[PDB]
C-alpha cells in the first residue's frame, strides 16, 4: 500500500435500538469474554430486533476497504434468543455492490467449542460513494473502515524472524 | 411443542436389582437428551448429557443410552442415595427446556395392603364453625393408591386434601391421610360420610363409613 | 461452581418478590443463568433465562409478562422478580447454569442453586388449634386401633408433635404439613395402638409451635 | 461421520431439483426443504429448485452433486428436510503430486 489509515465509520454507540455488547470466551481478553475489536455484534434489545440500518458516505479522499460479517447459528435456539426472529437477512449495497446473505442454521463440528460460524465479506467503497447496511438479524457490523492507496502490488513472505 | 413422557411413573426396584428407566419423545430430539437426579428436599443433580456421556463427579453405575424418540437410563447396582426422582430434558426443538414429568424410584418389598381408618369431626371443632372428616390409610406398598369421598352416597369434588409420608426407615412402607372439610352446617345437612380405597386387598374396594350421630 | 441464592421467602398475594442468584467460582458471565420452578409435588418448569453480555432475557409462554429477569454483572448476581403474586405461585425457584456459550449446542443445565421457597400467604404468626381424632368402632381393625391429632390453622412452619411426652414412638406417623386456601398450614399425627389399651392408657399429643410460643397438650378420649 | 481411516477422505453428496411441485410433494412430503452439510472448514446449504426443464433421459428434474475433502479426525454433518442424495461411501486419498488426463481410445501395454 501507499497509504493505509484506519478510520471510524459506524460508531459502536450509534445503535440505540440494538445490543452492541456481546461476544464469547473463544475470543477472550484478560480471561473475560470479548469479540473482534473493529466489529460490532448486533443482538436484540428489549426482546425485539427491529430492522437495523446503517450508511456511510465516503469522504476521506481515498478508496476505503470495508469488512462485514454474518452469523451462521448452530441451532434455532441461539437464533431465537439472540436475534429474536428466524428467516432473517443481511443486505449490503453500494453503487457497484448488491449482496444479500441469509443465516444458515445447522449443526456443525465444534471449533473452539462453537458449532456456529461467522462468515465475513469485504468491499472497496469508492470516493463520494455511500454504503448501505440493512439487516433483520445476524449482521456483524464494521465499526471501522480502511483508507487505501496502491501504486502497485507485491507479495507475502514467510521467514520467522528479525526485520533489520 | 415437544412432548416428553416417562414410563413408568413409579419404579419399584430392590437395592442391586438393576433399575432401568425410560424417556420417550413425540418427535426426534436426536442425540441431545439429559438426565437429572433430584433427591427429596434438594436441587437436581446433573447425571447424563448427550444421552450417553455422563457429567463430572458422577459414579459409573449410571449409564445413558438411546437416540431419536426412545432413550434409556441404567443403574447397575443401586445404592442408598439412588432412591429419588429422575427427569429427562430434551434440547433440540425451541424451547430446549421442556421437561418430563419424572419417574420416582422406591424400595421394592412385599405387597402391603393398607389398614383403612376413618374419623368423624370433633364436637370441639364443630363449635368453631368448620368440620374436618379424616380418612387414613396405614402401612401400604407401593405408594400408588386412590381415595374416593362419598357423602350421603354422593361423590365429592374439590374439597379433599392429601398428605403422604416418605418410605419408612424400618419396614419401608407408606402412610397416607385424606381430609375432607365442610362447614358445620353443611356437615349437619348430611347423614352418611364415606371414603373408599383402591390399592390392593381382595383387589378393591374396601370402604369405611359412619352415620352422623 | 456454586450458584448460591436466598432461601425461605414469605410474601402476601398481590406483592412482589425478587429472588437473587449469586455466582461463585469462575465467573464467565457469558454463560446463561436459567430460572426453573417446581410447585410442591409437581415437576420442573422453565420460567426464562438471561445471558448478561447479550442482555434482553427470555421468558416461557406461561411466565411471560408475569415475571421479569435482570442481572448485575458487577455483583455477579441474577434476579428473578415475580410481580403480583398469587396463592398458586407458591413454589421453589431454582437458578441453574447451562453448558453455556450460544452456538455450542450443549444446553443442558450443569450447575444449580439450593433453591428458594416462596410461600405466598397473607397470614402472620398463628398458633395451631388441636383437635382429637378419636378411636372408635371404625378406627379399630382387629387387634390394632388407631387414633390421632389434627393440628389445624397455624403459621408458619415448623411444628413439632410428640405423643405422651416422647414415651410413645412406635406406630407414630406425623404427616407432612399442607398449605391451605387460607394460606394456613395444617397436618395430622396418627398412632396405632393395641385396641385394648383404650380405657387404661391415656393418650396425649404434645404440639409445639415456637413462632407463636404456644405449647398445647391435647388428650384424646375414645368414643362409642 | 467422524473420520478415522488415517487419511484424508473425499466425500460426495447431491441434492434433487424437481421438475414440478407434484414430485416434490409425493417424494419428500414437504416444500421449502433444505440440504445442509457442515464440517470444520465447510458450511454449505442448498435448496431444492423446482422448475420445468427440457427432458434429458426423459426427466425434467436434475441432480446436482457437490464434494469435499474431510480431514483426519474431523466430523461431517448432513442435515436435510428433503431432496438430499446421501453418500454411502467415502474415499481415502493421498497425493505426492498431481498429473493429467489422456484421451487415447485403446490398449494399455
Ligand atoms: C456524499 O458526500 C459527498 C460530499 O462529501 C456529496 O457530494 C456532493 O454533493 C453535493 C450535494 O448535491 C454537491 O453539491 C457536490 O457537488 C458534491 N460533491 C462532490 C463529491 O463533487 C454526495 O452527494 C454525498 N452522497 C449522498 C447523496 O449521500
Ligand atoms: C473423532 O474421533 C477421534 C478419534 O478417532 C477423536 O479424537 C480423540 O478424542 C478423544 C476424546 O476427547 C481424545 O482423548 C483423543 O486425544 C483424540 N484423538 C486424537 C485424534 O488425537 C475425536 O474427538 C472425535 N471427534 C468427535 C468429537 O466426534
Q: How far is residue D12's CA from residue D91's CA, in Å, rounded to a whole number?
A: 9
Mark C24-41 as b/e (b = at least 16 C-beta within 10 Å).
eeeebbbbbbbbbbbeee
Strands C9-11 and C117-120: parallel
Name which CATH class applies to B1-109.
mainly beta
Q: Are A130 and A93 in contact (CB under 8 A)?
A: no
Judge contact between B8 and B103, C-beta under 8 A: yes
Q: Dig out the grid coordinates for A41 from the structure.
A: 455484534
Give the whole-angstrom CA distance, residue C182 versus residue B185.
19
Q: Which of C25, C22, C28, C24 is nearest to C7 (CA)?
A: C22
Asked if the Cβ–Cβ distance from B122 to C131 is below 8 Å, we say yes
Best mutation site among A79, A105, A109, A115 for testing chain D: the one with the most D CBs within 10 Å?
A: A109
Tell whether D36 lies on the interface with A, counting CB pairs under 8 A: yes
* Contact predicate A66/A145, CB 8 Å: yes
What torsion do the CA atoms of D56, D58, D63, D65 make, to the nearest 10 degrees? -50
Phi-psi region for residue C143, left (φ > 0), alpha (ψ -120 to 50) or beta?
alpha
| CATH pick for B110-213 out of 3.10.20.30, 1.10.150.120, 3.40.50.11810, 2.60.40.10 | 2.60.40.10
Q: What is the resolution of this structure in A?
A: 3.1
The whole-angstrom separation of Cα D86 and Cα A99 is 31
Grid coordinates belonging to B75: 443403574
Neighbour count for residue C214 (Cβ, 10 Å): 16
CA angle B124, C127, C187 (to 5 degrees): 70
- Region(s) of chain B under CATH 2.60.40.10: 1-109, 110-213
- List residues bridging with A7 in a β-sheet: A145
What's the gap in Å between A128 CA and the centre of ligand 1? 7
Concatenated DSSP letters for B4-39?
EEES-SEEEE-TTS-EEE-EEESS--TT-EEEEEE-
* Class of residue B111 by CB neighbours under 10 A (exposed 0-12, middle 13-18, buried 19+): exposed
CA-to-CA distance for C147 and D27, rounded, in angstroms?
A: 71
Q: What is d(CA A24, CA A137) in angstroms, rounded to the nearest whole number?
A: 18
Residue D30 Cβ inside 6 Å of ligand 2? The answer reads no
Count Cβ atoms within 10 A of the Cβ of residue A126 and give its class: 0-12 exposed, 13-18 middle, 19 or more buried.
Answer: middle
Q: For chain C, what percentages of helix, strand and coil (3-state, to nearest 5) are there? A: 5, 50, 45
Query: Would you state the cell numbers that stand for residue A126, as one nine-digit string?
Result: 469508492
Q: Count of CB atoms within 10 A of residue B23's CB?
A: 28
**Could you give the CA distance from residue B159 to residue B212 in angstroms, rounded to a whole number?**
19
Phi, psi (5° rounding) for residue B186?
-60, -35
Find out whether B46 and B34 touch, Cβ atoms under 8 Å.
yes
* Chains A and C lie in contact, requiring 3 or more CB pairs less than 8 Å apart: yes
Q: Are B178 and B160 in contact, with CB atoms under 8 Å apart?
A: yes
Peptide bond into B205 cis (omega under 30): yes
Q: Whose C-alpha lies nearest to ligand 1, atom 8?
A: A128
CA dihedral C93, C96, C102, C108 (to 10 degrees): -110
Burial category of D86 from C-beta neighbours within 10 Å (exposed 0-12, middle 13-18, buried 19 and up): exposed
Longest dimension (CA), chain B: 65
Looking only at the bridges linking them, the beta strands covering C203-209 and C109-111 are: unpaired
Residue C19 to chain A, least CA–CA distance (Å): 21
CATH for the A1-161 domain, from 3.40.50.2300, 3.90.209.20, 3.30.460.20, 2.60.120.330: 3.90.209.20
Task: Please state the length of chain D.
Answer: 109
- Alpha-carbon distance of C136 to B119, in angstroms, equals 8
Whether the CB-CB separation of B61 and B77 falls below 8 Å is answered with yes
Expressed in angstroms and rounded, the spacing between residue A142 Cα and the centre of ligand 1 is 23
For ligand 2, say whether the CB of D4 is within 6 Å of any of its atoms.
Answer: yes
- Residue C49 Ramachandran class (φ > 0 left, ψ -120 to 50 alpha, else beta): beta
The reply to whether residue A21 touches residue C29, judged by beta carbons under 8 angstroms, is: no
> In the numeric block, which cell numbers belong to residue C7?
432461601
B141/A81 Cα distance (integer angstroms): 47
d(CA B139, CA B170): 11
Q: Which residues of A touch D74 (CB under 8 A)?
A: 109
d(CA C154, CA C61): 36
**Grid cell at residue D89:** 461411501
- CA atoms of C148 and A148, how far apart (whole Å): 91
Side-chain half-sphere exposure of A123, counting CA atoms within 13 A: 20
Buried (b) or exposed (e) across B178-203, using 16+ Cβ within 10 A? Answer: bbbbbeeeebeeeeebbbbbebbbee
Strands (E) in chain A, as ranges, are: 3-8, 24-29, 32-34, 39-41, 52-57, 63-72, 90-93, 98-101, 117-125, 130-135, 139-142, 144-149
Q: First CA to last CA across chain C, in angstroms? A: 62
Q: Is the dihedral of CA B116, B120, B124, B125 positive or negative?
A: positive
Q: Tell me how far apart the alpha carbons of residues A138 and B88 are, in angstroms, rounded to a whole number.
A: 32
> What whole-number distance in Å separates Cα of residue D49 and Cα of residue D74?
30
Using an 8 Å Cβ cutoff, are C170 and C189 in contact? no
All three cell numbers of A99, joined, read 449482496
Q: How far is residue B63's CA from residue B72's CA, in Å, rounded to a whole number?
A: 8
> Nearest residue CA, atom 13 of ligand 1?
A128
**Ligand 1 contact via A95 beta carbon (within 6 Å):** no
Question: Do the chains C and B touch each other, judged by at least 3 C-beta pairs below 8 angstroms?
Answer: yes
CA distance B146 to chain A (A): 41
Ligand 1 mean position, distance from CA A58 (Å):
10
Cα distance between residue C124 and residue C90, in whole Å: 16
* Cβ–Cβ under 8 Å, residues C101 and C31: yes
Set of chain C residues whose Cβ sits within 8 Å of the Cβ of B208? 138
3-class SS string, B61-88: CEEEEEECCEEEEEECCCCCCCCCEEEE
Phi, psi of A12 (to 5 degrees): -60, -35
Q: How far apart are CA B176 and CA B165, in angstroms?
A: 7
- Report CA-CA distances (Å) from B167 to A109, B171, C14, C23: 47, 8, 37, 35
Taking Cα atoms as reference points, which of C185, C161, C164, C186 lies closest to residue C174? C161
The owner of cell 431439483 is: D17
Q: Is the backbone of residue D27 left (phi > 0), alpha (psi -120 to 50) or beta?
A: alpha
In 3D space, the residue among B63, B90, B59 whose CA is nearest the CA of residue B74 turns out to be: B63
CB B100 within 8 A of CB B4: yes
Closest CA to C22 of C42, C2, C8: C2
Q: Is A149 in the pocket of ligand 1 (CB under 6 A)?
A: no
Q: Is A116 helix (H, G, I), strand (E, B) or coil?
A: coil
Q: Which of B137, B134, B151, B157 is nearest to B191 (CA)?
A: B151
Q: How far apart are CA B96 and CA C106, in angstroms?
A: 10
Distances (CA, A) of B22 to A146, B108, B213: 59, 18, 52
The domain ranges of chain A are 1-161
Q: How many Å lie between the alpha carbon of D58 and the closest alpha carbon of chain A?
A: 34
Ligand nearest to the CA of A57: 1
Sequence-distant (6+) residues with CB within 8 A of D57 are none
Question: Omega before B8 cis (within 30°)?
Answer: yes
A130: its cell numbers: 455511500
Contact B131, B184 (CB under 8 A): yes
Look at phi and psi of residue C66 and say left if phi exceeds 0, alpha if psi is from -120 to 50, else beta: alpha
- Whether residues B93 and A80 touch (CB distance < 8 A) is answered with no
Contact between A105 and A70 (Cβ < 8 Å): no
**CB C79 within 8 Å of CB C17:** no
Q: Residue C3 corresponds to which cell in the numbers above?
A: 450458584
CA–CA dist B33, A52 (Å, integer) = 36
Using CA of residue C197, residue C198, residue C201, residue C203, what is the dihedral sign? positive
Q: What is the dihedral of CA C110, C115, C120, C123, to 10 degrees?
A: 180
Determined by X-ray
Query: Closest Cα to atom 16, ligand 1: which residue?
Result: A128
| N residues, chain A | 164
Domains of chain C: 1-122 (2.60.40.10), 123-224 (2.60.40.10)
Evaluate whether A107 touches A122 at the Cβ level (below 8 Å).
Answer: no
- How far is residue D61's CA from residue D16's CA, in Å, rounded to a whole number? 8
3-class DSSP assignment, residue B199: coil
Could you give the CA distance from residue C114 to residue C93 in angstroms, rounded to a whole number? 9
Close Cβ partners of B158 (under 8 Å, ≥ 6 residues apart): none
Amino acid at each position: 500500500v501507499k497509504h493505509f489509515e484506519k478510520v471510524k465509520i459506524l460508531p459502536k454507540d450509534r445503535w440505540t435500538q440494538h445490543t452492541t455488547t456481546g461476544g464469547s470466551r473463544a475470543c477472550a481478553v484478560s480471561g473475560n469474554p470479548s469479540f473482534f475489536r473493529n466489529m460490532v455484534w448486533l443482538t436484540k434489545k428489549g426482546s425485539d430486533y427491529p430492522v437495523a440500518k446503517g450508511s456511510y458516505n465516503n469522504t476521506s479522499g481515498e478508496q476505503m476497504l470495508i469488512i462485514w460479517g454474518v452469523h451462521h447459528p448452530n441451532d434455532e435456539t441461539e437464533q431465537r434468543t439472540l436475534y429474536q426472529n428466524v428467516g432473517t437477512y443481511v443486505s449490503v449495497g453500494t453503487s457497484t455492490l448488491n449482496k444479500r446473505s441469509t443465516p444458515e442454521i445447522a449443526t456443525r463440528p465444534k471449533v473452539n467449542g462453537l458449532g456456529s460460524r461467522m462468515e465475513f465479506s469485504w468491499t472497496l467503497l469508492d470516493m463520494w460513494d455511500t454504503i448501505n447496511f440493512e439487516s433483520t438479524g445476524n449482521l456483524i457490523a464494521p465499526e471501522y473502515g480502511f483508507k487505501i492507496s496502491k501504486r502497485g502490488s507485491s507479495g507475502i513472505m514467510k521467514t520467522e524472524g528479525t526485520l533489520e | 411443542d415437544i412432548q416428553l413422557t416417562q414410563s413408568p411413573a413409579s419404579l419399584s426396584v430392590s437395592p442391586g436389582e438393576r433399575a432401568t428407566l425410560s424417556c420417550r419423545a413425540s418427535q426426534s430430539v436426536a442425540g441431545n437428551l439429559a438426565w437429572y437426579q433430584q433427591k427429596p428436599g434438594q436441587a437436581p443433580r446433573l447425571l447424563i448429557y448427550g444421552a450417553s456421556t455422563r457429567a463430572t463427579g458422577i459414579p459409573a453405575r449410571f449409564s445413558g443410552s438411546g437416540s431419536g424418540t426412545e432413550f434409556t437410563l441404567t443403574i447397575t447396582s443401586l445404592q442408598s442415595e439412588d432412591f429419588a426422582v429422575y427427569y429427562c430434558q430434551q434440547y433440540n426443538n425451541w424451547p430446549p427446556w421442556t421437561f418430563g414429568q419424572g419417574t420416582k424410584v422406591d424400595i421394592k418389598r412385599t405387597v402391603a395392603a393398607p389398614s383403612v381408618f376413618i374419623f368423624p369431626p370433633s364436637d370441639e371443632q364443630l363449635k368453631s364453625g368448620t368440620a374436618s372428616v379424616v380418612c387414613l390409610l396405614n402401612n401400604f406398598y407401593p405408594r400408588e393408591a386412590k381415595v374416593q369421598w362419598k357423602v350421603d352416597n354422593a361423590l365429592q369434588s374439590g374439597n379433599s386434601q392429601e398428605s403422604v409420608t416418605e418410605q419408612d426407615s424400618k419396614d419401608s412402607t407408606y402412610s397416607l391421610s385424606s381430609t375432607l372439610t365442610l362447614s358445620k352446617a353443611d356437615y349437619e345437612k348430611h347423614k352418611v360420610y364415606a371414603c373408599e380405597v383402591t390399592h390392593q386387598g381382595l383387589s378393591s374396594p374396601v370402604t369405611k363409613s359412619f352415620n352422623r350421630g | 461452581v456454586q450458584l448460591v441464592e436466598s432461601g425461605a421467602d414469605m410474601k402476601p398475594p398481590g406483592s412482589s418478590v425478587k429472588v437473587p442468584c449469586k455466582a461463585s467460582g469462575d465467573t464467565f458471565s457469558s454463560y446463561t443463568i436459567t430460572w426453573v420452578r417446581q410447585a410442591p409435588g409437581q415437576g420442573l418448569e422453565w420460567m426464562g433465562g438471561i445471558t448478561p453480555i447479550f442482555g434482553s432475557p427470555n421468558y416461557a409462554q406461561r411466565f411471560q409478562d408475569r415475571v421479569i429477569i435482570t442481572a448485575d454483572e458487577s455483583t455477579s448476581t441474577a434476579y428473578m422478580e415475580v410481580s403480583n403474586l398469587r396463592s398458586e405461585d407458591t413454589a421453589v425457584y431454582f437458578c441453574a447454569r447451562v453448558g453455556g456459550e450460544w452456538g455450542s449446542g450443549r444446553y443442558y443445565l450443569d450447575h444449580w442453586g439450593q433453591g428458594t421457597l416462596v410461600t405466598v400467604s397473607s397470614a402472620s404468626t398463628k398458633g395451631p388449634s388441636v383437635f382429637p381424632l378419636a378411636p372408635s368402632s371404625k378406627s379399630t381393625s382387629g387387634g390394632t386401633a388407631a387414633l390421632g391429632c389434627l393440628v389445624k390453622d397455624y403459621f408458619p412452619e415448623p411444628v413439632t408433635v410428640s405423643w405422651n411426652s416422647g414415651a410413645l414412638t412406635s406406630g407414630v406417623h406425623t404427616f407432612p404439613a399442607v398449605l391451605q386456601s387460607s394460606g394456613l398450614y395444617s397436618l395430622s399425627s396418627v398412632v396405632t395402638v393395641p385396641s385394648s389399651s383404650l380405657g387404661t392408657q391415656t393418650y396425649i399429643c404434645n404440639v409445639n409451635h415456637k413462632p407463636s410460643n404456644t405449647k398445647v397438650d391435647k388428650r384424646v378420649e375414645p368414643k362409642s
